[PDB]
Design a protein around this ligand. Structure first.
Ligand SMILES: Nc1ncnc2c1ncn2[C@@H]1O[C@H](CO)[C@@H](O)[C@H]1O
Ligand SMILES: Nc1ncnc2c1ncn2[C@@H]1O[C@H](CO)[C@@H](O)[C@H]1O
Lengths: 6, 609, 4, 294, 610, 6
């Protein structure tokens, strides 16, 4: 997960 | 660039694949039956026609059929004919050809949308899709310009540009937004306006079809394209579509490798994009660092961002210069509290900021995550020493030994407050000095209406068992939105400023003037934050901090898409709601047509306090 | 060759 | 002598000179090693600068004991029974052997009454009797079912010792017998032989109870009784250590005479001063060497 | 072979990981907290102990933690202690260590099953698994022989379910944890192995690792680690499951380095058919049984049929023998044997008929009936290019086709993994009215066989086959074509249903399976045997399996709830082959030792469409 | 798909 996402 | 050759004449098929692979194409769009071999299915004697109906399977291997061949529907198959006999023969032949392509295991099948009414074609396709098990994609072959609009002005006695898009929209709506139905776009000589191309680029375009007739010739005789065509090719190359080349060689002195060579030339003529690669249109659940504990590999991608922590260090540096004059440089010690210290990076940023500001600081590193307290305390033992005091407590539960001059936190989500920065900083505000600073001191969230058929299909594909069947439309998704169309400019939703010396419940109404015609599919949420006076971090697409990739935008979907005309304002309303235990968002579109409030009482998505 |  | 030593002090033994032997291990942080320290000035402990001798071991110090006057017999976390020997000047601790015979952490080590044989218990369930002079293992005894908590050599009979374990067994061992172990009928966590009485031993369990057994009980502590040390008096007091971070000194009837709460972490080892029979030095995981007057 | 090193002493993690990977191990089983650093969680002053609790996560890269490290629970953590203080501290420390392993992103975590009561251990693990998002597997470290049964007989006043003890421990643990996918076995192999049926029950369990102490190794005449032949046989059986071998203990052969324990396992791996090569990637992978009558198969589905040469060799031999039997050599040149290949496919059974008539030197007039309109294209291109007038290709269903004459032999290939689950009886019933009264059907007869099996992995695969928008337990009422590999077979197969052609296809069978072990029943594996002609047979029954013939995997009929069986307890199951005018299905129910529900009533979860 | 299975 990237960009403050799971 | 990956490209294919569309042939309507395949005399022998292995020879044709040879002659197509030598000149560089990656697949071949060919008719599975003979395009002139009209079959009869109802009337004798032609119903009982003997012999094989088409070519054998065994002319190519299974891997050849599954990878190299894109089938085509025969041109005489007209399932929406006004003659009932033609209509029924065409239904039967369409089923026969689709079933034969499923049997051959082709990766794709190319069907034409060349008129307004394609309802019976949509029914036969959607009944094939729900019958049996097969995995072919269906590339619906639709032009940018209708064929009756690009005909010459030759006849003496005989929705303009939004026409074939409405053909495609009606087709994909009848087929209920199937994941297996996409667009193969035909690019003619007459390109439409720029806003028509944007709707087209928000669609499921898997292929682009370039006739050799739209190519114009240069002084050396090769095929090239006009500048407007080249710009369209670049926009399509951003989506990673495949290019199908149709027609005959209009530049006979050269060979047919020249069109493909020009396409590869434009391909080579074409950090956030590198980081976001592989994550495009991939929905994620937003992080909840307060209710869940993050893996160290989650903190690693935070600390992979140099720009955010450089900006935090710059803000702390300027604040320390402001709060302490050069005369009081040594006898004044400023208390900083890094709230949610993570694994270190804001504490290191504060230490470097006080080092380059040449000021003395007493730093507290508060962190509730015990596993991150382990690495913070190893940092403290090995590097920081007595300067940093590591606290294993929630900032809202902690009893500070002394008040702070600056509190620094990174509790901002992609929509600036979906990770409870207001509640956490309001809990931590009581150990701040009355002239104290909070970094960030300001943050605003921004919403813009978007359209994306692919994003809508991913949200539907997020439907899960043991759950409300449309809970997935009531959740924000952290998504690197890529294949979308944005309908209007972003507009500020919610603003929080710290310290708050005055309710974090908010209600916002946003009116978006839609200067084009579209189909609203959701809302994209960005944020801006002022850390200190002129130091800002932004993910808003016009003020985006360059090179910063720690935040992808938020998507708030809507349960049913809303068709919007030109001149129609979209009026949407957002609520930040809360109780003692949880915080959530509710949203509803109120104009042009209403929708239900999404996520009432946080039934599908809350943020846990 | 590739010149416009 | 290393510049700094590890926070968790694991053992402390006085020799006949009155010198103190500290064994420490690091149980947190980057390196989980251990160290030996000789403080011929026992009041300067735990300060690494004013040490007579000091050495760094490859792994932690689970237990140690004196082999006579110059020898330190360490149980390691690496499965190793180590024999270190102090140099004649007493300024270096040099390694005599380091034998890896246990498959797990050597929980405990003891020296049999002849001073030339030792016994080691491990988390591997076997109990090994060692010939210290030949640096080999004389015997290996897989007799328990779980990890061995304490082995306690008899001060009078050389072949006889005791061993408690996590399988709720206290076995009395006579190495001369064809079947050596004998079941001496809450898990026993510490053992101690009475210095004067031959067939009397005390043992403390995991609920805090210290009980005397003829080969009496008292709820001395609230948590696991870690150690049990007898004073050098003609009629001895018993120093009980526990995981509730307290020291208790008991008389011959297991009734409380002294109680100390000077430690802010687990109290690991206690040792009575041979020079000053009223002095009781206890070490703990809070890096604190506390000398009590009883 | 992939192998790891279990160490309980890691003074420096980078140095130790380097030294472990230097000597050939692929992962390192190590404690994430210090094994002796007992923490206090309730009572002061030791609750407020300062400093880091363990070493930092920055000592290895994130990929190093995610691929190279298997974490161990600390030995003092006893969540099932009878003292409440120890129990609470051990619950808290278990949670802390498991959460730190989840924070590190470790691929696996070793926990011990070294006592009978592990209910609180199971509860804390079950609560960890249902909390947060993490992907770590949990390897319950369980011995082959209980620790109290391995001790020497050296206690004078304490002289020394005996073999089925630690499996009972594991069974209770994984039953409490609701058969989680994330909980598996790390099996400790000791010096004394149990009996062969105890080793079979263990081999039907989710064993992801095998733990080999260096103390179970013998010594050569050259002084090298080796294992006994009974141990080597256990190693060879575990190498089939593709487990990882963990070496524990110290170097008990001190003359040579610790590489030798690993080198022997590499030697045995390098010293252990076409079916096994074809079946790789498909072990314990459930797929749906084919339904060629109501689903048109793809060309790639037919391709794997034609890829088996043994089945078509046998069909050609059966047609050869039948052609010799029905035509005397004196009437060789004037008798035409009308053959009908029913469900002709893309060709291969017609080619077998033609080759059979060539090697028999007999004259045949062949009809190739096929209902698949897309395989008729292949058949008619075959006829135009090769077969010519000898073969008449019919695009009809054998049950509704009107033949222009009656056949001497009808040849079909309509057999499934359970011999009648593709409606061969119903199809060949409608194909008898164009068979001559002395006419022959190939296959002549076919029988299906059933055997009770046990497999935790197959049971979890069937649970994982739950779909939304359907009955939440319908996945247990469908047969699955499965290369069932990690399973234990509880009894020998027995014949279920027999069909013979030319001939009610509804059937009822009762099978009683004597059980000599103490297992948990998870389903029934179904096989078949078919007689094509006189002594020419095709069989997938694992005792009479046709060699190298991979056209058919076994079928699996699950049961909704596992049925615990003990020794000397026969399992009585009943199968029904039910039908109506529209559909055909199977029903089954275990009636002894414990009844279960009838599975698939009215074909509500699975039918074969007529 | 193999072994007569999809
Ligand atoms: N209330 C809180 N107290 C302390 N740390 C917090 C709190 N909420 C979030 N954090 C931490 O803030 C960091 C960034 O969100 C993470 O390390 C997270 O664990
Ligand atoms: N009733 C039927 N009539 C003709 N062919 C059939 C029938 N049922 C199955 N088949 C064919 O039999 C083959 C089964 O392997 C397939 O080619 C399938 O199409």
């Amino acid at each position: 997960g990237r960009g403050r996402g799971r | 660039v990956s490209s294919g050759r569309d042939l309507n004449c395949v005399p022998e098929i292995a020879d044709t694949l040879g002659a197509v692979a030598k000149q560089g194409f990656d697949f071949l769009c060919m008719p599975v039956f003979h395009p002139r071999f009209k079959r009869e299915f109802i009337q004798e004697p032609a119903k009982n026609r003997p012999g094989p109906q088409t070519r054998s399977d065994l002319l190519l291997s299974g891997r050849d059929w599954n990878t190299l061949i894109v089938g085509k529907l025969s041109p005489w198959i007209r399932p929406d004919s006004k003659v009932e006999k033609i209509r029924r023969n065409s239904e039967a032949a369409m089923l026969q050809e689709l079933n034969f392509g499923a049997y051959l295991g082709l990766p794709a099948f190319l069907l034409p949308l060349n008129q307004e009414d394609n309802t019976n074609l949509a029914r036969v396709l959607t009944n094939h899709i729900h019958t049996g098990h097969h995995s072919s994609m269906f590339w619906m072959r639709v032009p940018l310009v209708a064929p009756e609009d690009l005909r010459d002005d030759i006849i003496e006695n005989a929705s303009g540009e939004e026409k074939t898009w409405m053909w495609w929209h009606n087709f994909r709506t009848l087929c209920d937004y199937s994941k297996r139905i996409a667009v193969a776009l035909e690019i003619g000589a007459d390109l439409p306006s720029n806003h028509v191309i944007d709707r087209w680029l928000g669609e499921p375009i898997k292929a682009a079809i370039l006739p050799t007739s739209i190519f114009l010739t240069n002084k050396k005789g090769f095929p090239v394209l006009s500048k407007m065509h080249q710009r369209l090719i670049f926009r399509l190359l951003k989506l990673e579509v495949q290019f199908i080349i149709t027609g005959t060689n209009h530049h006979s002195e050269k060979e047919f490798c020249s069109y493909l060579q020009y396409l590869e030339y434009l391909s080579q003529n074409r950090a956030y994009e590198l980081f976001a690669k592989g994550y495009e249109d991939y929905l994620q659940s937003p992080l909840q660092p307060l209710m869940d504990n993050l893996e160290s590999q989650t903190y690693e991608v935070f600390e992979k961002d140099p720009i955010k922590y450089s900006q935090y260090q710059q803000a702390i540096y300027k604040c320390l210069l402001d709060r302490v004059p050069e005369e009081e440089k040594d006898t004044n010690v400023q208390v900083l509290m890094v709230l949610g210290a993570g694994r270190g990076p804001l504490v290191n940023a504060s230490l470097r900021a006080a080092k380059q500001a040449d000021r003395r600081i007493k730093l507290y590193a508060v962190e509730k995550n015990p596993n991150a307290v382990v690495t913070l305390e190893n940092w403290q033992f090995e590097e920081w020493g007595s300067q940093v005091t590591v606290v294993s407590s929630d900032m809202r539960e902690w009893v500070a030994p002394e008040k702070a001059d600056i509190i620094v936190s990174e509790l901002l989500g992609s929509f600036a407050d979906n990770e409870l920065s207001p509640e956490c900083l309001d809990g931590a505000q009581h150990f701040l000095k009355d002239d104290g600073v909070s970094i960030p001191g300001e943050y605003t969230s921004f919403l813009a209406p978007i359209s994306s058929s692919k994003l809508y299909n991913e949200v539907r594909a997020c439907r899960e068992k043991d759950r409300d069947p449309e809970a997935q439309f009531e959740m924000p998704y952290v998504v690197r939105l890529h294949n979308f169309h944005q309908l209007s400019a972003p507009q500020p939703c919610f603003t929080f400023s710290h310290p708050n010396r005055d309710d974090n419940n908010r209600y916002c109404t946003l009116e978006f003037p839609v200067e084009v015609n579209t189909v609203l599919h959701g809302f994209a949420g960005y944020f801006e934050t002022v850390l200190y006076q002129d130091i800002t971090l932004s993910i808003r697409p016009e003020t985006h901090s360059p090179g910063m990739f720690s935040w992808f935008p938020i998507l708030f979907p809507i349960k049913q898409p809303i068709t919007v005309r030109e001149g129609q304002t979209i009026c949407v309303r957002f609520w930040r709601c809360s109780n003692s235990k949880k915080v959530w968002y509710e949203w509803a579109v109120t104009a042009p047509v209403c929708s239900a409030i999404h996520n009432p009482t946080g039934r599908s998505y809350t943020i846990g306090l | 060759q590739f010149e416009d | 002598a290393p510049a700094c030593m590890e926070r968790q002090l694991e053992a402390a033994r006085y020799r006949s000179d009155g010198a103190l032997l500290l064994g420490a291990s690091s149980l947190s942080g980057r390196c989980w090693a251990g160290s030996l320290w000789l403080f011929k000035d026992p009041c300067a402990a735990p300060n690494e600068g004013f040490c007579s001798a000091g050495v760094q071991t490859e792994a932690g110090v689970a237990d140690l004991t004196w082999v006579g006057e110059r020898g330190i017999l360490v149980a390691s976390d690496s499965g190793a029974v180590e024999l270190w020997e102090l140099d004649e000047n007493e300024t270096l601790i040099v390694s005599k052997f380091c034998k890896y015979e246990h498959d797990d952490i050597v929980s405990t080590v003891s020296v049999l009454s002849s001073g030339t044989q030792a016994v080691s218990g491990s988390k591997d369930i076997c109990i090994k009797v060692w010939d210290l002079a030949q640096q080999v293992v004389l015997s290996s005894y897989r007799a328990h079912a779980a990890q061995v908590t304490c082995v306690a050599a008899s001060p009078h009979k050389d072949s006889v010792f005791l061993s408690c374990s996590e399988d709720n067994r206290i076995l009395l061992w006579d190495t001369r017998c064809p079947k050596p172990a004998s079941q001496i009928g809450y898990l026993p966590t510490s053992l101690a032989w009475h210095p004067q009485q031959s067939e009397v031993f005390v043992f403390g369990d995991e609920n805090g109870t210290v009980s005397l057994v003829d080969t009496l009980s008292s709820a001395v502590h609230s948590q696991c009784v870690t150690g049990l040390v007898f004073s050098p008096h003609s009629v001895p007091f018993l120093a009980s250590l526990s995981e509730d971070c307290s020291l208790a000194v008991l008389d011959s009837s297991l009734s409380e005479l002294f109680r100390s709460q000077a430690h802010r972490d687990f109290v690991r080892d206690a040792t009575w001063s041979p020079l000053n029979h009223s002095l009781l030095t206890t070490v703990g995981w809070d890096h604190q060497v506390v000398h009590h007057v009883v």
